[PDB]
Design a binder for these strands. Sequence first.
RNA 1: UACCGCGAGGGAAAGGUGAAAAGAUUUUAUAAUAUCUUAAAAGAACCUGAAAUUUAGUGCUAAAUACAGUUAAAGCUUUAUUG
RNA 2: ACUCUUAAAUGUUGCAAAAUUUUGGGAUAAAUUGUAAUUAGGGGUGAAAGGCUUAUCAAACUUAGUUAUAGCUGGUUUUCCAC
RNA 3: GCAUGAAUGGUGUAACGACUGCUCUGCUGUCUCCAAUACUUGCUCUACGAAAUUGAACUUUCCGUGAAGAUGCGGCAAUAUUA
RNA 4: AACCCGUUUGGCACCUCGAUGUCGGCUCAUCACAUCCUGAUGGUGGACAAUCUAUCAAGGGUCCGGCUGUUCGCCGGUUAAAGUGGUACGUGAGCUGGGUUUAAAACGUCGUGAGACAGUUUGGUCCCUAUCUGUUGUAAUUACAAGAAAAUAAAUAAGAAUUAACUUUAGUACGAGAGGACUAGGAAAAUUUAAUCACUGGUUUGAAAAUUACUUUAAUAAAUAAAAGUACGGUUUUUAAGCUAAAUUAAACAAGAUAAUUGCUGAAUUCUAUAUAAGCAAGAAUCUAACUUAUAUUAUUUUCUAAUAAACUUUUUAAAGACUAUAUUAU
Lengths: 250, 156, 49, 64, 236, 126, 119
Amino acid sequence: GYKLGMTSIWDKWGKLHALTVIQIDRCQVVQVKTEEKDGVNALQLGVGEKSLKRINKPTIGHLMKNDIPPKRHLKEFKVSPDCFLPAGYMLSARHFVPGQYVDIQGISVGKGFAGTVKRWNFKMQDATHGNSLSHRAPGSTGQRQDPGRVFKNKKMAGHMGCEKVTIMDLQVYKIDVERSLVYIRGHVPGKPGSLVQIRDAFKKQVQNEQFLNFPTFVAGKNDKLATVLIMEASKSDPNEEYIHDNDVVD
Amino acid sequence: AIRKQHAYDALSILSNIHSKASEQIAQAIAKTISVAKLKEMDLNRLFIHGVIIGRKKKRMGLRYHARGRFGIKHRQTSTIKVILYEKPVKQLYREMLEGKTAPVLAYAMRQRMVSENADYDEIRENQWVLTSKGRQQRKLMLKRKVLIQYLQFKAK
Amino acid sequence: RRDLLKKVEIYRDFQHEKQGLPNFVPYTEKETFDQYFNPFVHNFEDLVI
Amino acid sequence: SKFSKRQTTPKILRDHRFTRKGMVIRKQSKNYDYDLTNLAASQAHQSHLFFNKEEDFALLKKQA
Amino acid sequence: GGLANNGHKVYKLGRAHSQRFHLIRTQLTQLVMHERITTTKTKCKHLKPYAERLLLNAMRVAKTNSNQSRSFLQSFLTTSLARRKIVKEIAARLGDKNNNFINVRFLSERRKGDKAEMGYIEIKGNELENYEKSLEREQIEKGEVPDLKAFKEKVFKQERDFLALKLKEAEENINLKKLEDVVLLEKGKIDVAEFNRREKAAAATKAFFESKLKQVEHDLFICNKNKYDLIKYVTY
Amino acid sequence: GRALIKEVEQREKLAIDRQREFKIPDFRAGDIIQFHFLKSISEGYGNTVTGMCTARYKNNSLMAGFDCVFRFHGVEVFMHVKQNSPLLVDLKVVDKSYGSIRQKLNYFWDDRTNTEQELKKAIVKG
Amino acid sequence: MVQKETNLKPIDKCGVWSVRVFHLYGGSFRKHSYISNFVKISVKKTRPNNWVPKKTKLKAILVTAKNELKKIDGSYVKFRSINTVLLKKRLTPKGKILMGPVSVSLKRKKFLSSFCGSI
RNA sequence: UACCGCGAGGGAAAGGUGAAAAGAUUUUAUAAUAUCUUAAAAGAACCUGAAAUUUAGUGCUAAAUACAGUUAAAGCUUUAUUG
RNA sequence: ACUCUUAAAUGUUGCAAAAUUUUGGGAUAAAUUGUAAUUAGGGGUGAAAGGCUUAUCAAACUUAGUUAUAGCUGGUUUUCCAC
RNA sequence: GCAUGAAUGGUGUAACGACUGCUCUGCUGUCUCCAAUACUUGCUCUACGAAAUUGAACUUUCCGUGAAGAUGCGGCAAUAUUA
RNA sequence: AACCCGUUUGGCACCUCGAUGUCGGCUCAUCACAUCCUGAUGGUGGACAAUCUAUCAAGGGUCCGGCUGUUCGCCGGUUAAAGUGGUACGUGAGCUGGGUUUAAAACGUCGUGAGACAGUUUGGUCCCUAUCUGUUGUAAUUACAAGAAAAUAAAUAAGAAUUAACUUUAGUACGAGAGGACUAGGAAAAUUUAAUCACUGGUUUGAAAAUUACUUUAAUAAAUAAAAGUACGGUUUUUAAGCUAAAUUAAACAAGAUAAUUGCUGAAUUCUAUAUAAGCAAGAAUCUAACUUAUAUUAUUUUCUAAUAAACUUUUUAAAGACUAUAUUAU
Ligand SMILES: [Mg+2]
Ligand SMILES: [Mg+2]
Ligand SMILES: [Mg+2]
Ligand SMILES: [Mg+2]
Ligand SMILES: [Mg+2]
Ligand SMILES: [Mg+2]
Ligand SMILES: [Mg+2]
Ligand SMILES: [Mg+2]
Ligand SMILES: [Mg+2]
Ligand SMILES: [Mg+2]
Ligand SMILES: [Mg+2]
Ligand SMILES: [Mg+2]
Ligand SMILES: [Mg+2]
Ligand SMILES: [Mg+2]
Ligand SMILES: [Mg+2]
Ligand SMILES: [Mg+2]
Ligand SMILES: [Mg+2]
Ligand SMILES: [Mg+2]
Ligand SMILES: [Mg+2]
Ligand SMILES: [Mg+2]
Ligand SMILES: [Mg+2]
Ligand SMILES: [Mg+2]
Ligand SMILES: [Mg+2]
Ligand SMILES: [Mg+2]
Ligand SMILES: [Mg+2]
Ligand SMILES: [Mg+2]
Ligand SMILES: [Mg+2]
Ligand SMILES: [Mg+2]
Ligand SMILES: [Mg+2]
Ligand SMILES: [Mg+2]
Ligand SMILES: [Mg+2]
Ligand SMILES: [Mg+2]
Ligand SMILES: [Mg+2]
Ligand SMILES: [Mg+2]
Ligand SMILES: [Mg+2]
Ligand SMILES: [Mg+2]
Ligand SMILES: [Mg+2]
Ligand SMILES: [Mg+2]
Ligand SMILES: [Mg+2]
Ligand SMILES: [Mg+2]
Ligand SMILES: [Mg+2]
Ligand SMILES: [Mg+2]
Ligand SMILES: [Mg+2]
Ligand SMILES: [Mg+2]
Ligand SMILES: [Mg+2]
Ligand SMILES: [Mg+2]
Ligand SMILES: [Mg+2]
Ligand SMILES: [Mg+2]
Ligand SMILES: [Mg+2]
Ligand SMILES: [Mg+2]
Ligand SMILES: [Mg+2]
Ligand SMILES: [Mg+2]
Ligand SMILES: [Mg+2]
Ligand SMILES: [Mg+2]
Ligand SMILES: [Mg+2]
Ligand SMILES: [Mg+2]
Ligand SMILES: [Mg+2]
Ligand SMILES: [Mg+2]
Ligand SMILES: [Mg+2]
Ligand SMILES: [Mg+2]
Ligand SMILES: [Mg+2]
Ligand SMILES: [Mg+2]
Ligand SMILES: [Mg+2]
Ligand SMILES: [Mg+2]
């Protein structure tokens, strides 16, 4: 997907839920990979657009087998042989349903040569007590003769950002289809126009068992499908979940 | 940076440094080229052998400091000897027919080809000196013609 | 050392993949001790009740 | 930095050749079988330039 | 296209607010008197937006004397000449234009002292911008200058006429060799196994000269392609 | 991009405003304002308060809001409303202002202590 | 937001006028104490001859705040002063009268019904 | 002597063309080098012109190892191989 | 203003061999200051601190006795053969 | 009163203090807790161009070792090369 | 009484006397286990609860404040607990300099006297641009497999926040009663950490409104109106976009192997014994596998390739950024 931006919406019970927007831009399979020949059971996919004057020749033949247009990124996903898909198959937001908890990969924003405080939330030294040129400095890096050297994975300045990360346990709030979007109840790594690589949560198959259909959503014949769709609100009101009376000091 | 290069190519390689030191050199190669004309040579065949450098003189002074101290600052000059050699015409074409012509020799050949409005026929003849890709054929065509003969022996 | 250890090869199976060399025969058999505790192995005329 | 970020274990215990399954001696043998008949237009004439087992090993054995 | 400040780019130039807006007003009063300035690349590229707005509020004044625009006109210009200059001398020269009044073009050389980039603003219908374009015209027509676009069109056209007669000599040689080799010689005295290699290899010659005849014609359309046309995609 | 995000925020505003039990009037700073703000939807208990609107934010969009100042049980207080929220149930104007005034006042919380009579009376200039 | 050494202004009618904090409940480390959290209190200013004399070590709940008291919809509420309720054993304030309003963001049903009204 | 110091006073650096100036003509977007003077340019702070320092040219040249070397074996090499 | 320099930061091969910036003391008086001149080495002068006496002060600077003395430190230049 | 004490002056004292010690109100980024901004400095290109220092140098971790705390010896190991 | 350790008070006087060091505090850490809490278990003069003792165990965690120059220590208040120690009693080429060891001065005591003190008191100056190692980050050049454009696995390592009120089981078991559980679960909050900027709050030399003094554009034709500069952006106030935390969202259980420890059958030791010698089973906040991120060590797949695959230089722009690199773009 391609992130776009953010919103926030009031739920039934009045709560303001932050929302993050994602737009799948022609997500489409390119290649199936089987364990026998290719060493692993997995797919890759392709999303986006690329003008015909920046394309490379072998990319064409890599795509032109399965008769699909050019793309802008290509990434893999390990899967099981039970849940393969064809080649050229296009994937939709219907692959997810709101209610299940979702993992994300992506690249974070970039700050630059981040100082010492900013990068690990160090504490400052005391300004205005005769302090001489060490207000934000780190201070001691190490000890004397024994060890006699600075250790590794030590805290210092450096490039903070553009780091590949994951964020587990994120909900899907609603869907649009005619405008192929997905809305997530939380934050994601990266300023918009940045790729994002989402999947079901390893960390919990229990909660999302209801909201899960393998290998993906078949349409079913002669049935009316919804273009827009939300989840059910909580069964309880946040304004009414009170503190217990005996939760008191003495 | 300027070694084993054609002389007029050095100046092209050298204007892109954007310095005083660059321009001081090109005044020397442009001298040596002027001597070669005077000595009746073929400037189209004039590669470079060595640019030699050496100190000449140092003029001292003082650079003051805090608390009555002082240092010694030296402005200084240098020397520039240049050497060139014209390859024989035969050795110049032992290279081209393998595909290692200097670009400057082609920049002239391209610029010549336009002043007099040339024709298509003159280009297919002189394509083995005229672009990189055309000069990659010749390194490849030449590798094929020897191999045809290598197989003519390997049968026996 | 490295030049030497570059010339060593190990396998888990009972084979090597090289060709033109022999292979150890594995020993899969297991001794049947059946002649000691079974009349059905012996001939009845050698035995006695 | 690479120099400073390293790990000082012996290579013998980092080595990629050794796996849970086995030791990776040379490589996989690859059957370079190509359908030389169902070719494209601009590669029909130069079909002889393509690898074919049954021809090449005939030649080495012929020359040898 | 900067996310920070409303999509716009900003140049600090080592100058604060008031110390910068004095630089604007001086260069702009100079950008109407002389209507051409040579500066660095960033001072030449920090001032384009201010000037592109400066002339609208002069063109508007010519059509419709507007208090809102003349107030913009007093602020950025200091003198009275420059105020009366552009309303009457410049704005009459342009003739109902809104979009773009001003050029910025860079330079290949750098200064001798600082070795800095350089570049010049010019109001778009300046005299020097016209005089310099007459010289290029005249020299290309009559003088020491190549006129490449004739030399290019010449060469693809000598080529195009040259490929065809090699195609003509191919269809002939295919036919004469085919009819000879298919009729007379299938009677015997040959190997008919290689008969495939006769036509199969000869037709490739046709395809060659025919596939190259695409490139040349595509190299001619592209030389005679108008701005207001589409993009012409090509086989491969 | 972002424009796609707005057109969703616009349709959803229209989906609410055309569905609310009441409508939005044209009020300004300096104008008095009533509203029944709720505590919960499971139980529709709330409070009705008369107050002097000090500011409006994002009028004609989805995060539209405003500010008021009023005196509740004899205690001066400030509150910041999301206009298109569901917890509002009523919104009404008592007294109108008149004349040239600033869009966002803020000198009723800061730099001042107030009485009842200054909060129940609009800004009026001749 | 409340920290050590905040001067407070109670609303319970026990004759006390101004009062200070010196400890915060709810864990090992607290650097701040938000609404509906407990504190300890020394007494600094009183009506004279009051049965709640100076320098008495008491407990209390704090009720109001001058910072933005958030609500779930996005709206928020904000008072001109901080207010507290001085306590005997548990939620059993000294003065039977309470004298003023409360913010709903403290979430205690029985404790709210005692008051006039809550925003 | 220069330079320093308010003052008494202190206190350096720095030689060489050629037998003879014959002190360098002519060509050249400007020859240290051809030509001319001379025994030779020794070319003006110019006899001879070491070392430290430093540039280029041709050879073999790395990819783990170290008071920077020694002893031994194998390999490649400029007609410089004497590496 | 002028004069002195309490407090902090800066600076420390600095703008400066004791300053910059901010702040602060006295400011008709035992005041501040210009010009020219006097007092001179165990003496001068000193609202006294062992301070000042041309960046040098538990006894100046320059020259001289003087190549001061040192049971002390640091150093003592080419080779081979014997004990 | 270990070892106070009367012109080495004892006791007390309004006013004055860039003096030393304690407390209060007000005030506030000193602190909880640190964030954003402007210029300078800095980083890149370009012209010019210092300083103390320095046995040589192709300059690795750990434990052990030992003129007693090892980059250099020993022992298992690390590093494609450099900026 | 037999051994160990090397944190105290000391003995010796081997290294350093040819520019440095002392306790304490701020910032920053790392290690041991002889463990303060959490977790497992045996024993008990162990009914339950609370507690005492011993063993296994280092995963993560371990307070603010008043007086003192102060580690310590007393005190007030709390917490699941407020651990013992090593690292030139860690950390001054990373900060401070309050104490103590210079010069001024004073009291007391000793001393004829100069002056002195393991007594007190006020005051009180050392500096540094980082060559190499080491480290946090960033690239360049090159190599591998024919050459090249892309996507992955494998392997090793690193990393991972602790606690639990309150509540359900249950006022049940236990108990004269008072009181009050093991087990199996849910879970607010505090501290810490990561991603993010739709809302809120702060910021704004970017945009704007109002406005004082002097001057000016430019005016000895007037009048009205506009505009500019200087005064901390002149001052006060509002605010777009971004960054930001005071803001938002959220931080697994289980499975396998084992440590102290529990058990089945059954000999040696003719046993209704013994968890072991054949043999069959259990056992933790740990370790592993899994999960996350990185990586010139090896390998796989896809596709293209010289009558034409590719890559590099330059321009524009950036959501990327010291430089570069990556991204984007033109012919
Ligand atoms: Mg950035
Ligand atoms: Mg923080
Ligand atoms: Mg601090
Ligand atoms: Mg300092
Ligand atoms: Mg500072
Ligand atoms: Mg050590
Ligand atoms: Mg070490
Ligand atoms: Mg020098
Ligand atoms: Mg600058
Ligand atoms: Mg200003
Ligand atoms: Mg509006
Ligand atoms: Mg506000
Ligand atoms: Mg002669
Ligand atoms: Mg001669
Ligand atoms: Mg000489
Ligand atoms: Mg003064
Ligand atoms: Mg005063
Ligand atoms: Mg006075
Ligand atoms: Mg004295
Ligand atoms: Mg003096
Ligand atoms: Mg004397
Ligand atoms: Mg004598
Ligand atoms: Mg003597
Ligand atoms: Mg006495
Ligand atoms: Mg006395
Ligand atoms: Mg007496
Ligand atoms: Mg006295
Ligand atoms: Mg007295
Ligand atoms: Mg007295
Ligand atoms: Mg007195
Ligand atoms: Mg005083
Ligand atoms: Mg006292
Ligand atoms: Mg924080
Ligand atoms: Mg090395
Ligand atoms: Mg050691
Ligand atoms: Mg040895
Ligand atoms: Mg070693
Ligand atoms: Mg000794
Ligand atoms: Mg020592
Ligand atoms: Mg000595
Ligand atoms: Mg030394
Ligand atoms: Mg233990
Ligand atoms: Mg620990
Ligand atoms: Mg763990
Ligand atoms: Mg105090
Ligand atoms: Mg104190
Ligand atoms: Mg305590
Ligand atoms: Mg020490
Ligand atoms: Mg220490
Ligand atoms: Mg140190
Ligand atoms: Mg006496
Ligand atoms: Mg003082
Ligand atoms: Mg360095
Ligand atoms: Mg080193
Ligand atoms: Mg963060
Ligand atoms: Mg935001
Ligand atoms: Mg705001
Ligand atoms: Mg402002
Ligand atoms: Mg103004
Ligand atoms: Mg001024
Ligand atoms: Mg903002
Ligand atoms: Mg188990
Ligand atoms: Mg038995
Ligand atoms: Mg038993």
